[PDB]
Amino acid sequence: DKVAVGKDGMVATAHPLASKIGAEVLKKGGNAIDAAIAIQYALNVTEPMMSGIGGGGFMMVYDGETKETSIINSRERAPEGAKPDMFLDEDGKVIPFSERSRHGNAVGVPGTLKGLEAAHKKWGTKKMEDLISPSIKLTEEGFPIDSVLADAIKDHQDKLSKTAAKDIFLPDGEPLKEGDILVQKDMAKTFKLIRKEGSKAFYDGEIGRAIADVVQDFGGSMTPDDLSRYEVTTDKPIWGEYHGYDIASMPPPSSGGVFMLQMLKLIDDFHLSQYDPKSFEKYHLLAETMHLSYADRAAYAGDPEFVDVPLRGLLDPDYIKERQKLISLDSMNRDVKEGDPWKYEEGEPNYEIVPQPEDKTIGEATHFTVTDQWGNVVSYTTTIEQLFGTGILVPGYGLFLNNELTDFDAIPGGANEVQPNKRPLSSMTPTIVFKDEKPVLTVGSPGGTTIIASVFQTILNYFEYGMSLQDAIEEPRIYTNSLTSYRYESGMPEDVRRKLNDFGHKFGSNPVDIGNVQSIFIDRENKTFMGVADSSRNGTAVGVNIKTSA
């Protein structure tokens, strides 16, 4: 079911099998981290277009013992053979996203598996053999697919029809429909090999060199030395405060936390509870806020190891006011340029503001969350950049490679320019909300740049409007990053949309799904966990109740 309640454990994932697997891990004494790993593998199996060991993600973990919140950063790095103008042709103009998404240089160094390694060596309590076996037997013996997978295959037949993925997903040229069984023998082989040799086989073994060869064959410049040079990082979350709660989220190289918190700070003083959850005022103010935030994102966000992001000025109260001057109910801001936070901050941008064309299909990830009986809290957002990533299947291994490096700017000079060993700017937002410095909520969503809007709104809907968790998730969302791009979910009143367009907005004719939030609420005063999965997909929440003497 989409909503469940537990007392000793709780799991919320995008695929039911992964949910029941993680729940099983919790059931026989495992913790939230073990479950997180098992769920990662199960998601690799059942939803290979969203997450994988050929991709990367951000894993937020709240430790039950040390009471510390840390982040396993497994973002992909560019090879040192990667160049700033590698997204430009010989004529100095931007290669279309359709070709960029599938090319060799779009592939970054996969970091997921090493992230799982670090997580297992820090908080792991069960043998990873046990954690990977169910996924192995899920790829070996097959499984009946869901509607999301089938629709994804049918919508991306063309990308899959040029790689080693056809003979698996397009048997005779026909995509596997809902109910069809998906068998992945080669994937099972890779999982078994990893079960044998560990991460060694991936980063210093046959799998690595194979990935290298197929990448170079697709025009890439990645070497096995690039793989063997890779290490995950550990990040301290970015902190904000909203209506008495402390919010912990993802800092650079992700843009999620900073500007989600910025949107919160910007819209807080308008008190949206004053208006109706489907009124003109709320939607309008949301849009006006998002424009400013994304405007800043397009100019000030990038890998902190390479460029300086002005966090301190992006969240400064006086700066927030200065930007709030541009937000009003009586008019619409038609000149949406990035603000100047550097006033309120020591330092100077070591780059320039470089305009980018908006040729970006927006990609989808997967987010999941786990909670155990020891106060450990896991909120993991993992991704290959887009559905099936590049589409490139590692030959003989049945593994999809990401196109994460497209998250870089096509035109160099900016903070998010292509640099070697540099991590591309992400929009993912794994987030944990605390009260009295103790975890009470988990928020996270997939869908590239829209994620920030999905989380924000959700959080808003939960605290400003005080709605229930499922109501906060299911409450229709909107998205806009410019005066040209607008999206709205099914649920917005037609007259309100029409008036919004009369005010200068550009909402389209038909609605689309925005994000997919899985969340876990921690009710300590009732000693239970509540799990909710978004209806946008076939997500699932499963609770765990363990008897004493067990």
Burial of 202-220, coded b for 16+ CB within 10 Å and e otherwise, reads bbebebbebbbebbeebeb
Percent of residues in the chain assigned helix, strand, coil, to nearest 5: 35, 15, 45
CB 486 to Na ion: min, Å: 20
The span from the CA of 180 to the CA of 145, in Å, is 6
Q: Is 449 a residue of the active site?
A: no
Catalytic residue among 46, 139, 233, 361: 361
CB 163 to Na ion: min, Å: 20
Using CA of residue 187, residue 381, residue 438, residue 475, what is the dihedral sign? Answer: negative
Backbone angles phi, psi at 104, to 5 degrees: -55, -35
3-class SS string, 415-475: CCECCCCCCCCECCCCEEEEECCEEEEEECCCCHHHHHHHHHHHHHHHHCCCCCHHHHHHC
The span from the CA of 9 to the CA of 334, in Å, is 49
CB 425 to Na ion: min, Å: 9
Cβ nearer to Na ion, comparing 324 with 445? 445
Q: Which two tokens stand for residue 133?
A: 């076996």
Q: Which residue is nearest to Na ion (CB)?
A: 448
CB 506 to Na ion: min, Å: 24
The span from the CA of 82 to the CA of 79, in Å, is 5
The span from the CA of 437 to the CA of 59, in Å, is 19
3-class SS string, 199-264: CHHHHCCHHHHHHHHHHHHCCCCCCHHHHHCCCCEEECCEEEEECCEEEEECCCCECHHHHHHHHH
Cβ nearer to Na ion, comparing 115 with 448? 448
Cβ nearer to Na ion, comparing 277 with 448? 448
The span from the CA of 511 to the CA of 488, in Å, is 5
The span from the CA of 220 to the CA of 233, in Å, is 24
Inter-CA distances, 93 with 12, 87, 264, 403, Å: 44, 9, 37, 20
Backbone angles phi, psi at 141, to 5 degrees: -95, -10
N-term to C-term CA, the chain:
25
State how far Cα 30 lies from the chain centre.
25
Cβ nearer to Na ion, comparing 341 with 448? 448
Residue from 91, 74, 103 nearest 215 by CA: 103
Question: CB–CB of 61/69 below 8 Å?
Answer: yes
Cβ nearer to Na ion, comparing 134 with 448? 448
Backbone angles phi, psi at 129, to 5 degrees: -55, -50
Question: CB–CB of 372/543 below 8 Å?
Answer: no
Cβ nearer to Na ion, comparing 208 with 448? 448
The span from the CA of 120 to the CA of 37, in Å, is 8
Question: CB–CB of 507/484 below 8 Å?
Answer: no
Q: Which two tokens stand for residue 166?
A: 């056809």
Backbone angles phi, psi at 90, to 5 degrees: -75, -10
One-letter amino acid identity for 305? E
**What does the binding site for Na ion look like in residue numbers (CB under 5 A)?**
448
Catalytic residue list: 361
